[PDB]
């Protein structure tokens, strides 16, 4: 890895990878900033390679066409050898790990609830046993998928409530869901990743996360299968974690920058 150059696939997603706020055009890696940009910088420092950030062209993380065997997104880019590393808010999942390899996690998370502050609602269970408060998710997102496939009775009942609701509780973006909570006066809760919720609550003091996590998953760096660099990056992630550098990066991007 010393004196090598890697292509890093990523995806625009706040605050992991973002276009910098400057009217002056920026070139190459310089146009981007965020937690993932800083993470690959720290990994490249420890291991001494150069890299080039390329946004994934189809703007997708990676899903499998069960019928055709066809992948899209960042996963496809690794499998086609157009990227050496995928560094993003990319979840380690069973389906993806059949096609690519993942490092140990650099961030942990789970589905949770975004709601208004100062209510009696304390848990998913308080939502499910009632009908006045509506709740939804990003249409066709990973949170919607979790509820669709859950066989935990509480969440199966919640997906049932979600699909049976009219007008529609699903949103076309997470900023639309956040607005629906912010303007809903308690009539609407939004389901998304806990990391996304933290980012929102840092910037909207009337909003809060309700309860804990409804599932447990992680973001890791994905590599082509049997990549010769996964094991070296694993050690770097654990070192950065233990030194507190990942905690600093999270504080920086969730609480300091905007």
Binding site, annotated residues for L-glutamate: 91, 96, 142-143, 193
Q: List the beta strands (DSSP E) in the chain.
A: 5-10, 18-19, 32-33, 50-55, 64-65, 70-71, 85-86, 101-102, 107-109, 111-116, 134-137, 188-193, 207-210, 217-219, 222-223
Nearest residue (CB) to a copy of itself, 92 versus 182: 92
Judged by CB under 8 A, the stretch of 18-26, 47-55, 88-96, 173-181 that binds a copy of itself is 88-96
Task: Please enumerate in sequence order all residues whose Cβ is within 8 A of that of 147, keeping only pairs 6 or more positions apart, or say none.
Answer: 137, 155, 158, 159, 162, 191
Nearest residue (CB) to a copy of itself, 19 versus 117: 117
107 binds a copy of itself (CB under 8 A): yes
Give the three-class secondary structure for 70. Answer: strand
Cα separation of 175 and 114, whole Å? 12
Nearest residue (CB) to ligand 2JJ, 61 versus 161: 61
Q: Residue 45 Cβ, how far from ligand 2JJ at the closest point, in Å?
A: 26
Cα separation of 57 and 248, whole Å? 30
Cα separation of 145 and 127, whole Å? 19
Nearest to 92 by CA among 175, 214, 215, 203: 215
247 binds a copy of itself (CB under 8 A): yes
Among 32, 51, 61, 190, which residue interacts with ligand 2JJ (rule: CB under 6 A)?
A: 61
Nearest residue (CB) to a copy of itself, 151 versus 166: 151
223 binds a copy of itself (CB under 8 A): no
Looking at residues 82 to 111 of the shown chain, list those that interact with ligand 2JJ (rule: CB under 6 A).
89-91
Number of residues in contact with ligand 2JJ under rule CB under 6 A: 11
| Partner that binds at residue 104, options ligand 2JJ, a copy of itself, none, CB closer than 5 to 8 Å by kind | a copy of itself
Structure tokens that stand for 47 in this block: 């291991």
Task: Please enumerate in sequence order all residues whose Cβ is within 8 A of that of 155, keeping only pairs 6 or more positions apart, or say none.
Answer: 124, 146, 147, 214
Q: Residue 244 Cβ, how far from a copy of itself at the closest point, in Å?
A: 5
Contact positions toward a copy of itself, by CB under 8 A? 92-94, 97-98, 102, 104-105, 107-108, 149-152, 198, 212, 214-218, 220, 234-235, 238-239, 241-244, 246-248
């Amino acid at each position: 890895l010393k004196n090598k150059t890697l292509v890093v696939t990523t995806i625009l997603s706040n605050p992991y990878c973002m276009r910098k706020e400057s009217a002056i055009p920026l070139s190459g890696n310089d146009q981007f900033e965020g937690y993932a940009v800083d993470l690959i910088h720290e990994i490249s420092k420890s291991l001494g390679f150069n890299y080039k950030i390329q946004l994934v062209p189809d703007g997708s993380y990676g899903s499998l066409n069960k019928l055709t065997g066809e992948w899209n997104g960042m996963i496809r880019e690794l499998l086609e050898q157009r990227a050496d590393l995928a560094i993003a808010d990319l979840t380690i999942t069973f389906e993806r790990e059949q096609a690519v390899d993942f490092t140990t996690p650099f961030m942990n998370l789970g589905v949770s609830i975004l709601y208004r502050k100062g209510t009696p609602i304390e848990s998913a269970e308080d939502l499910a046993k009632q009908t006045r408060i509506k709740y939804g998710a990003l249409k066709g997102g990973s949170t919607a998928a979790f509820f669709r496939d859950s066989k935990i009775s509480t969440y199966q009942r919640m997906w049932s409530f979600m699909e049976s609701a009219r007008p529609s509780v699903f949103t076309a973006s997470n900023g639309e869901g956040v607005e629906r909570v912010a303007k809903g006066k308690g009539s609407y809760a939004f389901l998304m990743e806990s990391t996304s919720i933290e980012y929102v609550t840092e910037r909207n003091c009337e909003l809060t996360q309700v309860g804990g996590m409804l599932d447990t998953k992680s973001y890791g760096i994905a590599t082509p299968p049997n990549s010769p660099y996964r094991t070296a990056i694993n050690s770097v992630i654990l070192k950065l974690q233990e030194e507190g550098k990942l905690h600093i990066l999270k504080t920086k991007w969730w609480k300091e920058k905007r």
